Design a protein around this motif. Structure first.
Motif, mmCIF file in Angstrom:
data_model
loop_
_atom_site.group_PDB
_atom_site.id
_atom_site.type_symbol
_atom_site.label_atom_id
_atom_site.label_comp_id
_atom_site.label_asym_id
_atom_site.label_seq_id
_atom_site.Cartn_x
_atom_site.Cartn_y
_atom_site.Cartn_z
ATOM 1 N N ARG A 65 0.786 -1.255 0.009
ATOM 2 C CA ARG A 65 -0.166 -0.147 0.089
ATOM 3 C C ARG A 65 0.870 1.338 -0.249
ATOM 4 O O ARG A 65 0.064 2.628 0.168
ATOM 5 C CB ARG A 65 -1.230 -0.194 1.248
ATOM 6 N N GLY A 66 2.226 1.165 -0.294
ATOM 7 C CA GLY A 66 3.060 2.532 -0.162
ATOM 8 C C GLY A 66 3.606 2.646 0.911
ATOM 9 O O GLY A 66 3.079 2.429 1.881
ATOM 10 N N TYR A 67 5.035 3.280 1.033
ATOM 11 C CA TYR A 67 5.716 3.407 2.436
ATOM 12 C C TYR A 67 5.214 4.925 2.717
ATOM 13 O O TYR A 67 5.494 5.880 1.836
ATOM 14 C CB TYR A 67 7.275 3.321 2.166
ATOM 15 C CG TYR A 67 7.695 1.933 1.806
ATOM 16 C CD1 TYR A 67 8.883 1.776 1.255
ATOM 17 C CD2 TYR A 67 7.222 0.761 2.194
ATOM 18 C CE1 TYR A 67 9.626 0.474 0.908
ATOM 19 C CE2 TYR A 67 7.760 -0.451 2.073
ATOM 20 C CZ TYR A 67 8.862 -0.918 1.273
ATOM 21 O OH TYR A 67 9.571 -1.784 1.148
ATOM 22 N N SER A 68 5.090 5.159 3.971
ATOM 23 C CA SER A 68 4.503 6.315 4.590
ATOM 24 C C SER A 68 5.592 7.297 5.267
ATOM 25 O O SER A 68 5.311 8.431 5.552
ATOM 26 C CB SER A 68 3.264 6.079 5.436
ATOM 27 O OG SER A 68 2.305 5.566 4.850
ATOM 28 N N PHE A 69 6.744 6.637 5.293
ATOM 29 C CA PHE A 69 7.905 7.412 6.047
ATOM 30 C C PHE A 69 8.646 8.075 4.856
ATOM 31 O O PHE A 69 8.718 7.570 3.938
ATOM 32 C CB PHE A 69 8.861 6.567 6.848
ATOM 33 C CG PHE A 69 9.156 5.177 5.934
ATOM 34 C CD1 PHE A 69 10.353 5.286 5.324
ATOM 35 C CD2 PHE A 69 8.160 3.934 6.438
ATOM 36 C CE1 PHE A 69 10.695 4.088 4.562
ATOM 37 C CE2 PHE A 69 8.859 2.791 5.576
ATOM 38 C CZ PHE A 69 9.797 2.859 4.958
ATOM 39 N N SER A 70 9.364 9.286 5.378
ATOM 40 C CA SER A 70 10.218 9.897 4.593
ATOM 41 C C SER A 70 11.351 8.960 4.128
ATOM 42 O O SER A 70 11.988 8.243 5.104
ATOM 43 C CB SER A 70 10.857 11.408 4.997
ATOM 44 O OG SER A 70 9.596 12.042 5.323
ATOM 45 N N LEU A 71 12.004 9.202 2.989
ATOM 46 C CA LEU A 71 13.465 8.437 2.670
ATOM 47 C C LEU A 71 14.247 9.537 2.552
ATOM 48 O O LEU A 71 15.579 9.213 2.257
ATOM 49 C CB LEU A 71 13.032 7.799 1.185
ATOM 50 C CG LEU A 71 12.045 6.785 1.046
ATOM 51 C CD1 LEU A 71 12.121 5.987 -0.146
ATOM 52 C CD2 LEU A 71 12.114 5.718 2.308
ATOM 53 N N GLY A 93 6.189 10.605 1.582
ATOM 54 C CA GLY A 93 6.209 9.096 1.998
ATOM 55 C C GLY A 93 6.935 8.115 0.850
ATOM 56 O O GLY A 93 6.360 8.049 -0.048
ATOM 57 N N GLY A 94 7.944 7.426 1.053
ATOM 58 C CA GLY A 94 8.386 6.463 0.103
ATOM 59 C C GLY A 94 8.758 6.641 -1.086
ATOM 60 O O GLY A 94 8.738 5.960 -2.171
ATOM 61 N N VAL A 95 9.222 7.877 -1.432
ATOM 62 C CA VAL A 95 9.854 8.377 -2.662
ATOM 63 C C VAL A 95 11.339 9.044 -2.378
ATOM 64 O O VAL A 95 11.388 9.457 -1.244
ATOM 65 C CB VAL A 95 8.816 9.300 -3.494
ATOM 66 C CG1 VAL A 95 7.444 8.748 -3.760
ATOM 67 C CG2 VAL A 95 8.395 10.689 -2.456
#
Ligand SMILES: *[C@@H]1CC(=O)N(CC)C1=O
Ligand SMILES: *[C@@H]1CC(=O)N(CC)C1=O
Ligand SMILES: *[C@@H]1CC(=O)N(CC)C1=O
Ligand SMILES: [Cl-]
Ligand SMILES: [Cl-]
Ligand SMILES: [Cl-]
Ligand SMILES: [Cl-]
Ligand SMILES: [Cl-]
Ligand SMILES: [Cl-]
Ligand SMILES: [Cl-]
Ligand SMILES: [Cl-]
Ligand SMILES: [Cl-]
Ligand SMILES: [Cl-]
Ligand SMILES: [Cl-]
Ligand SMILES: [Cl-]
Ligand SMILES: [Cl-]
Ligand SMILES: [Cl-]
Ligand SMILES: [Cl-]
Ligand SMILES: [Cl-]
Ligand SMILES: [Cl-]
Ligand SMILES: [K+]
Ligand SMILES: [Mg+2]
Ligand SMILES: [Mg+2]
Lengths: 237, 248, 239, 233, 234, 204, 230, 244
Positions: free
Chosen positions: G1-7, G122-124
């Motif tokens: 469903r997508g990563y919600s934390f900052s990368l 998140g996740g990008v």
């Protein structure tokens, strides 16, 4: 939305995020409360001084409603969120019960908010403890304390923040029917309690009082240093 | 995925929030930015970092933003983050205006934004905004005002302050020269140039390297102006003349 | 480590989580399918892990549409779930388009579903390979096989599980294009008996199903009397 | 670090086992079931004389016929107690009857493993409850005591202790308990055991006691009623 | 090791350690036995008591008039699954006005319990069930596992020291189909008794019985009601 | 009729290097006058005004929501909005409510903030714009207003003539309408100043 | 469903290293140049065009956003196509509301804001490109750069991609304020020759221009003509 | 820099300190796992795709072993790399083309279809939670103005039109072969397109094919519909090549 479990158990039953939130409280400025006979008093340290600071904008004692106020120690931004949530709630209560909140009601509300943030995904706990004071509808004076875990208790007197251990020790010796027979002595008991820990005494102890039906009054630096001298010249005898 | 989550919104063992502290390091390196309150006004003075010779000069400033009729701000830190925040300040100020039909009081604007910054330290798993801000303004409750906010979502009111490069040194100089109750816009302007002169110690100060904005009242209306370069050189001149006087 | 997520390539361009799921199929006992002149026959070496289980427990042959059989190897809970996906796909195809799903289309659709579980940290690859078999007058006999990566091909003969290679070499001896389903069941049973390791794993049930002209395009269990004769033929052939 | 719903090689959920360890940090509570009613008794564990003792409530009323003693992380117990309360009133609303002790305990226990980070609502429970509970009450089965822990396992007990000194207290309970014991004997027994296991000298302000009897509603003992019982002990 | 904390991580051997760990939850539960004749299906369970003063944990649960279960592993997972089963049975009677066939319910279990074995951040069910039922196809005993696999059984035992119970059951299983009910339950108890330490015995306090058949809705027998079945072990 | 519940009238008119905008002053509810100093013309710029007739609640909401959007626009862009661009902003605001519209039909009058060129327009309640080189009218006496404007308006009027024309067009139009009037306000917009006048007028 | 934390997060020294590393992808990109003449703007870029096998006409680096605005970039091509598409869409959204072409500065702001999102959301990862954006409005030319952080700058002239530092000093000692567009095209193509390596043809550089008439790509024949003097 | 790595930059699509995406680079290696090579060439009249066809197992129904796919009636494709990934990409392409026709009332141009698939691939290079597809798509079709087209897109989301191109194990060698051959040719343009394609593939592999070991697909200006050659049609080409 972010669903990570942040507060989790460790081996031996610890909740490390909560313990760490408690560390944040212990590095806050000292705050003290005493429950008098028909007055309640809150005093709090410092925090830094700084002559270029607008004093008004950084107080650590806050009205929640007309009959309930609070002091906190810990992360000042965290507190501001807790304070505003509690203010909203005091108005919801008045709306649906047509009485002001009891001090215990709002305390219980703050505490369970805190507890929720130790058991919900995506959030860390609030890094603050609070001392909450007021009067019930029947005139009974009240002093409650909450901490990051969401535990709460009523107190005769208490301290939180840096040096709470020694300030509490002092209050255990000095809280007697005699030290709170009158308003001035109750106030002075708080100033003595701080003056112990408060670095360049004092100078920087913000102080506030609440009387039965009378709403919050904060003391100015002129009105404070009256009590300081009135206690300092007494401790020579 | 648990493995890749850097966990931006949790406590460390001493009750610290590392990302907030790390963002505070970013700010400390950014262009120095100072604010000074006077009796007849408030000012912002900022080190320009957009200083290469081939730049075009297209906006009326680099780091001074108008927020609404009665307020402006400057920033130190990550520029793109500062654009998000200043856009959100403008929205908050219009939402109030819509609802109440009077301008948002200065502290109320500051507090509303700080609560957004606070949220980013407590939930959502994102990096915080790498920005500190100085706000100047006038409202009908407390008149001329100067506020400072940082990535913790904390703020305070100040009579004078500094953020960004050499902050500590700048505040020291202000502690000594600033006269509580007795400053004018002209003396505050002079003190601002004094402070930037000392704290841009790499190297010799110039109008192309600073931005100054003033906020005053005239005929019951707020006026916000970015000083033109002529006025900036003139003030630097007066400071350099004033140092000739120093000994005899 | 490069082998913990299906959304991570290794430096040589492999996806190890898909390969590990393949290893679960390769640990399983053997299933085979043989396409012939007039239909498709499936056989499974079904290991019996306790004598307390009923005959037929843990079936590895399924009906996924009235005309389509499925034979599986690998983790059985994954296979059953794939059989439900296949069933649903066949059902929705009939509801939307008004006729029996063609085998190839069914295979390709279920294969794209299997494939979707090979791209993401959020989910793991299916630990199963499976065959699909059908017959009709219009399309003839068809046998497809799908693996955990989502690859799908058609076959004359096929085997999955731990004695895959040994089974294929026996199947290669048949001229299956000219034989009938009645002839082929005996040969399926024979091949399962050959590849079975009677020392290492002790007790198995043979499972047999077919779909062909003789069942009128319906996928059915091989009747009991015919299965027992095929077993007897296999056993004596082992001699 | 691993996920909150990870099993250990022994077939247990790490988080539930750790929550069970947190129960051991609580104050001792005791429950005893007799044919004349059930008593619940709990060590308050006062940490400062400045603390108001009556603001430590570790025995609470669920309904008129059911009380609850808790031990462990007390703040966690709040949502559990509220759920028991709400559930007994829903039951009264729908069915016009009181809910059984067993039924209430069951309803609460169905919350216990409802935690995790990629099934449920935008911020649902991140971890289990660090709490053990003794529900004591009277319904048509007679007087009844049930224990529940963070695994969601619950069971009827003739007598049970929870918290720091529960081994110990449970041993003394095996010794003193008998099926035909009176309620007043059960009250004395549990005050005697608390007295042994407590660090502080027992008195009428650093303990709580409640009963529920076939005749009579949930009753918290007053300072005065406690002093009376403490005389012999 | 890096392969044992997530149900979505296959090991290099083609195994899923989280599923295997969940199965330990059932091996460490107290033993239960399930067996059947031509006409009845029986469950027999050992209840563990926390202390000498505790009652004894319910091991046998009603699902519908024609279906009951015995559990081993996490009790909270057992209830959640039991509640799922109950609901599937109610739905089938609401829609079709007839009992849900036992093998169909067991299928629905396999499907439901498989789902979390394949999604990140979920976990297997840490419970195993023995399922006694009676329908058009006669009596049944099924077994379900944390792997989401299930088995149709002549008889079965799961839980601590159930190997002994399994060995007994294999020894006598050719007699089960023709037993009357008392004979069948005696067999279940004897199997369960093999799980016990040599000192200890079956008593009315530690044995729980579940029975269903052609003439009899799923009925649970506890405490004094097991005594008829325990006298006759002679 | 919803648009006649409160009554009222606005118009705008073009002259050489100047524009005019005017409105009646009544706030009434059907037959009942409530007040006689109700504002219907609102500044959107030093040299740019919007007049709104129709349902009084929506006069106010559109003026306020419009100001919200214009303020954000001006802060974000370098600059003062052009008249034509305000028209588009308003059209977009009204057309968002295509299926539950605001009951107001505004007129805009102003000078371009750089060129000082005169602009006038009006819009219907769902945001169809209409620009003209003479006049626009809106309200419960639109016919009366058209009769006066068609007969009196002339091109290239200086500020004084523009004032007299728009004033006479309004006064005489509203005196044939029961639910408009109780006063008239007129704004004349020039490059170097705004002149605002209230007119001697019937109060029945 | 997508990563919600900052990368992208802050390092201990206050650096957002994923952004810096995005800037390293830009720095290794093929060179791009932009010069603002008095009466227009020129954008020029080097095709990293190996093979005679490429159909040079099949994809463009110099792209129109509106009639009056165009773009070029250095860094990762596919990241650029995302931003071209968004910029186009933002320009039309503006046009539908205001019925006036988006001012260049306003378009840059909105695009720069999209680039900022990809440093926090998140996740990008951030975009591995820097954009040079040209336009003409209010009777005047504009040249802007937008970088992977979402920061933007208005330039008289600049360079980006491989060898940009030298390219910038080459322009520093060569641009004047009163310079014409045709001469600017000339100095832009020389700036690329400073770092080219390969021998330039009209098939391996791309040039776009912006003036009162609007934004457009130069045709291969026009480029060929400018190439004769070089 | 120079092969450096920090944090999780070899596991997910974040930048390495040189500004690389290792996971994207690894997807290109995944293309060669299959072991096959494909070639595509365009002339004035036609565009052709040729790939290897390896049927090692006798038990396969070899009519189901193909890497050639019809996208629309007028657009064909050859896929190279991981098979199931490729099939997914083929379905997506079919969906994009059908959707385009329904919305816009004319057939998707080949360039636009390639750009669309490349943009979809781009997303996998920027979002962390999924891997890129380990495959490469080559598209052929006739454009009404530009003539025959060959387009290719990759796991980075890069795409381009070509005079000729290749994919898989022997891509570089094929590129070399094809470049050398176009420079010779006037107006840098191929003319014997099917022969160049097969000859390229035969050289770079050293094989000399039987007709059942390659597949061939074409589109022509006179016959724009995508057509797959039969074994006999391919054989005619192999024979005509053998005899000079
Ligand atoms: C499934 C099959 C079996 O024997 N077990 C072991 C506990 C299961 O749960
Ligand atoms: C010309 C090039 C091509 O592909 N064809 C079709 C067979 C031709 O004839
Ligand atoms: C397609 C068009 C072009 O010139 N390139 C650069 C190599 C392409 O990729
Ligand atoms: Cl909340
Ligand atoms: Cl504290
Ligand atoms: Cl404003
Ligand atoms: Cl305002
Ligand atoms: Cl296999
Ligand atoms: Cl305990
Ligand atoms: Cl158990
Ligand atoms: Cl359990
Ligand atoms: Cl299993
Ligand atoms: Cl077991
Ligand atoms: Cl609005
Ligand atoms: Cl996430
Ligand atoms: Cl586009
Ligand atoms: Cl446009
Ligand atoms: Cl163009
Ligand atoms: Cl269509
Ligand atoms: Cl050729
Ligand atoms: K990715
Ligand atoms: Mg009138
Ligand atoms: Mg009248």
């Amino acid at each position: 939305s972010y669903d990570r479990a942040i507060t989790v158990f460790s081996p031996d039953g610890h909740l490390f995020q909560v313990e760490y939130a408690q560390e944040a409280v212990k590095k806050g400025s000292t705050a003290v409360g005493v429950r008098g006979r028909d007055i309640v008093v809150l005093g709090v340290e410092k925090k830094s001084v700084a002559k270029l600071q607008d004093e008004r904008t950084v107080r650590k004692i806050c009205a929640l409603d007309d009959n309930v106020c609070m002091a906190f120690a810990g992360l000042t931004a965290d507190a501001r969120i807790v304070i505003n949530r509690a203010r909203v709630e005091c108005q919801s209560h008045r709306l649906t019960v047509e009485d002001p909140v009891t001090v215990e009601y709002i305390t219980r509300y703050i505490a369970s908010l805190k507890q929720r943030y130790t058991q919900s995904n995506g959030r860390r706990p609030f890094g603050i403890s609070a001392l909450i004071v007021g009067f019930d509808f029947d005139g009974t004076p009240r002093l409650y304390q909450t901490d990051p875990s969401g535990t709460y208790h009523a107190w005769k007197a208490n301290a939180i923040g840096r040096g709470a251990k020694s300030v509490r020790e002092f209050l255990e010796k000095n809280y007697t029917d005699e030290a709170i027979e009158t308003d001035d002595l109750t106030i002075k008991l708080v100033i003595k309690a701080l003056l112990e820990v408060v670095q360049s005494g004092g100078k920087n102890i913000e102080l506030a009082v609440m009387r039965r039906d009378q709403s919050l009054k904060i003391l100015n630096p002129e009105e404070i240093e009256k009590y300081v001298a009135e206690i300092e010249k007494e401790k020579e005898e | 995925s648990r493995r890749y989550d850097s966990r931006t919104t949790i406590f460390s063992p001493e009750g610290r929030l590392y990302q907030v502290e790390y963002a505070m390091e970013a700010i400390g390196h950014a262009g120095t930015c100072l604010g000074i309150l006077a009796n007849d006004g408030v000012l912002l003075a900022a080190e320009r970092r957009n200083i290469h010779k081939l730049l075009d000069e297209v906006f009326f400033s680099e780091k001074i933003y108008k927020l609404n009729e009665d307020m402006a701000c400057s920033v130190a830190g990550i520029t793109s983050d500062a654009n998000v925040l200043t856009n959100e300040l403008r929205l908050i100020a219009q939402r109030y205006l819509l609802q109440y039909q009077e301008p948002i009081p200065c502290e109320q604007l500051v507090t509303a934004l700080c609560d957004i910054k606070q949220a980013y330290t407590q939930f959502g798993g994102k990096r915080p905004f790498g920005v500190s801000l100085l706000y100047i303004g006038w409202d009908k409750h407390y008149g001329f005002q100067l506020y400072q906010s940082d990535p913790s979502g904390n703020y305070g009111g100040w009579k004078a302050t500094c953020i960004g490069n050499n902050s500590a040194a700048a505040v020291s100089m202000l502690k000594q020269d600033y006269k509580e109750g007795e400053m004018t816009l002209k003396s505050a302007l002079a003190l601002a140039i004094k402070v930037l002169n000392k704290t841009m110690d790499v190297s010799k100060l110039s109008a192309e390297k600073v931005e100054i904005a003033t906020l005053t009242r005239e005929n019951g209306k707020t006026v916000i102006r970015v000083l033109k370069q002529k006025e900036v050189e003139q003030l630097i001149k007066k400071h350099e003349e004033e140092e000739a006087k120093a000994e005899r | 480590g490069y082998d913990l997520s299906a959304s991570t390539f290794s430096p040589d361009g492999r996806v190890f989580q898909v390969e590990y799921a393949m290893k679960a199929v390769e640990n399983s006992s053997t299933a085979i399918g043989i396409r012939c002149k007039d239909g498709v026959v499936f056989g499974v070496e079904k290991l019996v892990l306790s004598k307390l289980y009923e005959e037929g427990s843990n079936k590895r042959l399924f009906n996924v549409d009235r005309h389509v059989g499925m034979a599986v190897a690998g983790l059985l809970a994954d296979a059953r779930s794939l059989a439900d996906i296949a069933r649903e796909e066949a059902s929705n195809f009939r509801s939307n388009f008004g006729y029996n799903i063609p085998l190839k289309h069914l295979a390709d659709r279920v294969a794209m579903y299997v494939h979707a579980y090979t791209l993401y940290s959020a989910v793991r690859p299916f630990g199963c390979s499976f065959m699909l078999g059908s017959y009709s007058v219009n399309d003839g006999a068809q046998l497809y096989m799908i693996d955990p990566s989502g690859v799908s091909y058609g076959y004359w003969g096929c085997a999955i599980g731990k004695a895959r290679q040994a089974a294929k070499t026996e199947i290669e001896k048949l001229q299956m294009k000219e034989m009938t389903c009645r002839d082929i069941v005996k040969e399926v049973a024979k091949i399962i008996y050959i590849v079975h390791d009677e020392v290492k794993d002790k007790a198995f049930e043979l499972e047999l199903s077919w779909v062909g002209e003789l069942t009128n395009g319906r996928h059915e269990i091989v009747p009991k009397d015919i299965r027992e004769e095929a077993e007897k033929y296999a056993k004596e052939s082992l001699k | 670090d691993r996920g909150v719903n990870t099993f250990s090689p022994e077939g247990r959920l790490f988080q539930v086992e750790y929550a069970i360890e947190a129960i051991k940090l609580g104050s001792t509570a005791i429950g005893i079931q007799t044919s004349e009613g059930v008593c619940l008794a709990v060590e308050k564990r006062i940490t400062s004389p400045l603390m108001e003792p009556s603001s430590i409530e570790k025995i609470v009323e669920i309904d008129a016929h059911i009380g609850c003693a808790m031990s462990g992380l007390i703040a966690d117990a709040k949502t559990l107690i509220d759920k028991a309360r709400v559930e007994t009133q829903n039951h009264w609303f729908t069915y016009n009857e009181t809910m059984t002790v067993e039924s209430v305990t069951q309803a609460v226990s169905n919350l216990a493993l409802q935690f995790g980070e990629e099934d449920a609502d935008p911020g649902a429970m991140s971890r289990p409850f660090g709490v053990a509970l003794l529900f004591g009450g009277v319904d048509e089965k007679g007087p009844q005591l049930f224990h529940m822990d963070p695994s969601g396992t619950f069971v009827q007990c003739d007598a049970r202790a929870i918290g720091s000194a529960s081994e110990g207290a449970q041993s003394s309970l095996q010794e003193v308990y008998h099926k035909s014991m009176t309620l007043k004997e059960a009250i004395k027994s549990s005050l005697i055991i608390l007295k042994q296991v407590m660090e502080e000298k027992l008195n009428a302000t650093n303990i709580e006691l409640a009963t529920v009897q076939p005749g009579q509603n949930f009753h918290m003992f007053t300072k005065e009623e406690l002093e009376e019982v403490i005389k012999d002990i | 090791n890096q392969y044992d904390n997530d149900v979505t991580v296959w090991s290099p051997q083609g195994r899923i350690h989280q599923i295997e760990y969940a199965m330990e939850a059932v091996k460490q539960g107290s033993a239960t036995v399930g067996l059947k004749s031509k006409t009845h299906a029986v469950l027999v369970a050992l209840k563990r008591a926390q202390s000498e003063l505790a009652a004894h944990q319910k091991k046998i649960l009603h699902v519908d008039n024609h279906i009951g279960i015995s559990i081993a592993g996490l009790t909270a997972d057992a209830r959640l699954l039991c509640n799922f089963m109950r609901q599937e049975c109610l739905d089938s009677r609401f829609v079709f006005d007839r009992p849900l066939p036992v093998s169909r319910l067991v299928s629905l279990i396999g499907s439901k319990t498989q789902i979390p074995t394949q999604r990140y951040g979920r976990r297997p069910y840490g419970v195993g069930l023995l399922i006694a039922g009676y329908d058009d196809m006669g009596p049944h005993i099924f077994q379900t596992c944390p792997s989401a696999n299930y088995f149709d059984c002549r008889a079965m035992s799961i839980g601590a020291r159930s190997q002994s119970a399994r060995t007994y059951l294999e020894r006598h299983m050719s007699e089960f189909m023709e037993c009357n009910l008392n004979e069948l339950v005696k067999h279940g108890l004897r199997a369960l008794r093999e799980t016990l330490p040599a000192e200890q015995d079956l008593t009315t306090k530690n044995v729980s019985i579940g029975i269903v058949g052609k003439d009899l809705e799923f009925t649970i027998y506890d405490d004094d009601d097991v005594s008829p079945f325990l006298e006759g072990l002679e | 009729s919803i648009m006649s519940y409160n009554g009222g009238a606005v118009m705008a008119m073009k002259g050489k290097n100047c524009v005019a905008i005017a409105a009646d002053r009544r706030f009434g509810i059907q037959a009942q006058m409530v007040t006689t100093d109700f504002q219907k013309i609102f500044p959107m710029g030093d040299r740019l005004y919007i007049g709104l007739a129709g349902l009084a609640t929506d006069v106010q909401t559109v003026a306020q929501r419009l100001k919200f959007r214009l303020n954000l626009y001006e802060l974000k862009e370098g600059r003062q909005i052009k008249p034509y661009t305000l028209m588009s902003m308003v059209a977009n605001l009204l057309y968002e409510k295509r299926f539950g519209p605001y009951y107001t039909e505004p007129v805009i009058a102003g000078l371009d903030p750089k060129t000082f060129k005169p602009f006038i327009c009006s819009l219907d309640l769902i945001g169809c714009p209409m620009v003209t080189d003479d006049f626009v009218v809106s309200g419960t006496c639109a016919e009366q207003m058209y009769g006066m404007c068609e007969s009196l308006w002339e091109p290239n009027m200086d500020p004084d003539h523009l004032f007299e024309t728009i004033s006479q067009a309004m006064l005489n139009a509203v005196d044939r309408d029961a639910v408009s009037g109780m006063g008239v306000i007129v704004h004349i917009i020039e490059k170097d100043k705004i002149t605002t006048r209230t007119l001697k007028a019937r109060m029945d | 469903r997508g990563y919600s934390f900052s990368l992208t997060t802050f390092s201990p020294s206050g650096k957002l290293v994923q952004i810096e590393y995005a800037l390293a992808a830009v720095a290794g990109g093929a060179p791009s140049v932009g010069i603002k003449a008095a009466n227009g703007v020129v954008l020029a870029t080097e095709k990293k065009q190996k093979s005679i096998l490429y159909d040079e006409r099949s994809v463009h680096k110099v792209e129109p956003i509106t009639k009056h605005i165009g773009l070029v970039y250095s860094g990762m091509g596919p990241d650029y196509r995302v931003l071209v598409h968004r910029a186009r869409k933002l320009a039309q959204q503006y046009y539908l509301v205001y019925q006036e072409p988006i001012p260049t500065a306003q378009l840059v702001q909105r695009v720069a804001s999209v680039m900022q999102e990809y440093t926090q959301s998140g996740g990008v990862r951030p975009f591995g490109v820097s954009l040079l954006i040209c336009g003409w409005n209010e009777g005047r030319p504009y040249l802007f750069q937008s970088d992977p952080s979402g920061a933007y700058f208005a330039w008289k002239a600049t360079a980006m991609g491989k060898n940009y530092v030298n390219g910038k000093t080459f322009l520093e000692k060569r641009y004047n304020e009163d310079l014409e567009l045709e001469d600017a095209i000339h100095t832009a193509i020389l700036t690329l020759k400073e770092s080219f390596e390969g021998q330039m043809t009209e098939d391996n550089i791309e040039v776009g221009i912006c003036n009162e008439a609007g934004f457009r790509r130069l045709t291969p024949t026009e480029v060929k003509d400018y190439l004769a003097a070089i | 820099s120079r092969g450096s790595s920090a944090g999780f930059d070899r596991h997910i699509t974040i930048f390495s300190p040189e500004g690389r995406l290792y996971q994207v680079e690894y997807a290109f290696k995944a293309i060669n796992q299959g072991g096959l090579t494909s070639v595509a060439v365009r002339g004035k009249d036609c565009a052709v795709i040729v790939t290897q066809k390896k049927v090692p197992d006798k038990l396969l129904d070899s009519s189901t072993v193909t890497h050639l796919f019809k996208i629309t009636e007028n657009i064909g494709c050859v896929m190279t790399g991981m098979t199931a990934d490729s099939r997914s990409q083929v379905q997506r392409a079919r969906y994009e083309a059908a959707n385009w026709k329904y919305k816009y009332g004319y057939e998707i141009p080949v360039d636009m279809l390639c750009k669309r698939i490349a943009d979809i691939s781009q997303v996998y290079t920027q979002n962390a939670e999924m891997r890129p597809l380990g495959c490469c798509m080559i598209l052929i079709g006739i454009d009404e103005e530009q003539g025959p087209q060959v387009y290719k897109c990759d796991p980075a989301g890069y795409y381009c039109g070509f005079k000729a191109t290749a994919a898989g194990v022997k891509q570089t060698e094929s590129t070399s072969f094809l470049e050398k051959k176009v420079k010779k040719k006037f107006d840098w343009t191929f003319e014997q397109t099917v022969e160049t394609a097969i000859t390229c593939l035969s050289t770079v592999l050293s094989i000399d094919f039987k007709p059942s070991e390659i597949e061939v697909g074409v589109v022509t200006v006179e016959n724009p519909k995508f057509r797959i050659l039969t074994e006999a049609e391919i054989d005619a080409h192999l024979v005509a090549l053998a005899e000079r």
